[PDB]
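Q: Hi! New to this. If I give you a protein sequence and the SMILES for calcium ion, can you show me the bound structure?
A: Yes, paste them in.
Q: Okay, here:
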Amino acid sequence: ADNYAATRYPIILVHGLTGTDKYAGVLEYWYGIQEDLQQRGATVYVANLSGFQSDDGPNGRGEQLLAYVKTVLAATGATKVNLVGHSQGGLTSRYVAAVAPDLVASVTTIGTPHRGSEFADFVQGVLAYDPTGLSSTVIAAFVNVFGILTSSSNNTNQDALAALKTLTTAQAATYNQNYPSAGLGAPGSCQTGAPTETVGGNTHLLYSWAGTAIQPTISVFGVTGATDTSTIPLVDPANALDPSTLALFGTGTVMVNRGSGQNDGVVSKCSALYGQVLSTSYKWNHLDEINQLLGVRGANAEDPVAVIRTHANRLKLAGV
Ligand SMILES: *[P@](C)(=O)O[C@H](CC)COc1ccccc1
Ligand SMILES: [Ca+2]
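A: Thanks. Here is the predicted structure of the protein with calcium ion bound:
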């Protein structure tokens, strides 16, 4: 152990949709990451928010995170925290940074759909094809139960329908209007914004990176085929030991056929851009970003634990 990742302010990891700090109280969302960071001298806390909800609103993940941030500060005696969110977690972090700027020192998003997800649009579109609308109710009930059951604390505040809408591209654009950020570029520009922001007199260091394992590699008869660049073609063990590898390749293919361009199976490169874009070259699918499942990744995928560890050091050197 050492203090390679010893940051001034406590680090809080923020999970995305379907998440919880510890699935069924057994499998941790940020697989092996909290242990690694702490071994390197960092003070880390893992948020436990609704796996299914919008980010804003009375019952949203945003207010949940705000309240959690406050308990972390009170317990540590620190005055600010570094927010590190994955997927939707990044949106929840942006919410706290905006409404409570004085409590945040930095915001880092990993594969966060700042502009929404083409796969979210897809899934929502699928539900709309049921003229009776009953599938929304039935499927929502099923997902909500999954949320309650997998939540480490069996949080009953789950709203799959609101979570799905929150992640669509049209809704994401609206979210960015209500919660503007200097770290965001112009919509439809596929560009990032500034590396830092000053809200209400409080400066925040902004960072981000994305996984682009799923690449468009061939187009024929209007159809676009992709390639999972995270794996060694065909024989990669990650395809057998991690069920999400191929699943994400499948969802990633649906996205490129919806005009997403390179992605990680859930979030496009353009949608993930925020603050200082450290990288968008990682050959990662959406779950490799959080060292999942159970630390399995394709042969060509960079080590997610090391990347996050190095960032903690980056934050340290930056003064936060
Ligand atoms: P981010 C968007 O929170 O990703 C989740 C896995 C961590 C799942 O996101 C979705 C959203 C809609 C349809 C499929 C997956
Ligand atoms: Ca994986």
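A: The CA atoms of residues 31 and 190 lie 30 Å apart. Let me know if you'd like me to explain how to read the tokens.
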